[PDB]
């Protein structure tokens, strides 16, 4: 490898989005360029809609995916992943005036890898509270997968982009959403969004998988080996931590 093409969504701030000049910016872009410098490879970022981001990788339209993509078991059946470059729990989003905010959280950190009757009881409590509540999620996400598999009795609307989800929540067309803390914290930290609040347990594992990684074709074992060495070095020297604070306003970097 001398040169690779990396796909990103271009509409998932602060991971990947467009600046005032329409240039691709974000945590994914800065990290991607940093990892490619360590691998001594020419880096080109391209914009790709979330819908066909995985089949365009397997079809050879580009060489990698850096688009806030969770290393989830369903995706591992189709593509390979690098080592996680970011770890993030998942939580719920609603309006600041919502009665949903007064709900008691019995389990602050909820792992989904081996759901106990206690963990299931907490999941069922939230499922029953979310009955009658209109939920909105971006289509093709682990957020949609969680709602369909874990909370099927909850009415959900799916969207092309996360920006349309946020728009409809602020407009009052939906009552709640679900995304990672890495997306929801910088969003709710904005003075623009003081009318929006995070709530409920912070969930990890299960269908959400084990962090955010680089999507690579399964046959490209050498490119994965290069990315894994570059990510381990970027984590060790504190580059991931620095970019996490810069873009997310907190440290979401993994530990060695
Ligand atoms: N359109 C990007 C959504 C990415 C999503 N990752 C969760 C998240 O980082 O909020 C997923 O893996 O499904
Ligand atoms: Cl966004
Ligand atoms: Cl081809
Ligand atoms: Cl990614
Ligand atoms: Cl309230
Ligand atoms: Cl509370
Ligand atoms: Cl979503
Ligand atoms: Cl329903
Ligand atoms: Cl939409
Ligand atoms: Cl609401
Ligand atoms: Cl929370």
From Swiss-Prot:
Please name one Pfam family that this protein belongs to.
Answer: SBP_bac_3
Listed name of the protein: Nopaline-binding periplasmic protein
Q: Name one GO cellular component term.
A: outer membrane-bounded periplasmic space
Q: Which SUPFAM superfamilies match?
A: Periplasmic binding protein-like II (SSF53850)
What are the GO MF terms of this UniProt record? ligand-gated monoatomic ion channel activity
Quick one: where is this thing mainly located?
periplasm
Organism of provenance:
Agrobacterium fabrum (strain C58 / ATCC 33970) (Agrobacterium tumefaciens (strain C58))
Q: Which family does it belong to?
A: Belongs to the bacterial solute-binding protein 3 family.
């Amino acid at each position: 490898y001398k040169s690779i093409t990396i796909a990103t969504e271009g509409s998932y701030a602060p991971y990947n989005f467009k600046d005032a000049g329409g240039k691709l910016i974000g945590f994914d872009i800065d990290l991607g360029n940093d990892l490619c410098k360590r691998m001594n490879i020419e880096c080109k970022f391209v914009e790709q809609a979330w819908d066909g981001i995985i089949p365009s990788l397997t079809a050879g339209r580009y060489d990698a995916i850096m688009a806030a993509m969770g290393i989830q078991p369903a995706r591992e059946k189709v593509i390979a992943f690098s080592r996680p470059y970011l770890l993030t729990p998942m939580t719920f989003l609603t309006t600041a005036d919502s009665p949903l905010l007064k709900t008691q959280v019995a389990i602050e950190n909820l792992p989904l890898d081996n759901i106990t009757p206690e963990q299931k009881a907490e999941l069922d409590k939230f499922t029953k509270i979310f009955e009658g509540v209109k939920f909105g999620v971006q289509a093709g996400t682990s957020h949609e997968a969680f709602m369909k598999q874990m909370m099927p009795s909850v009415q959900i609307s799916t969207y092309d982009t996360i920006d349309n989800v946020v728009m409809d929540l602020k407009a009052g067309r939906i009552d709640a959403s679900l995304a990672s803390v890495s997306f929801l914290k910088p969003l709710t930290d904005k003075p623009d969004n003081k009318d929006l609040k995070m709530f409920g347990p912070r969930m990890t594992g299960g269908l959400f998988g084990k962090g955010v990684g680089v999507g690579i074709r399964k046959e490209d074992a050498d490119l994965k080996a290069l990315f894994d060495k570059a990510i381990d070095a970027a984590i060790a020297d504190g580059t991931v931590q620095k970019l996490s604070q810069q873009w997310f306003g907190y440290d979401a970097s993994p530990k060695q």
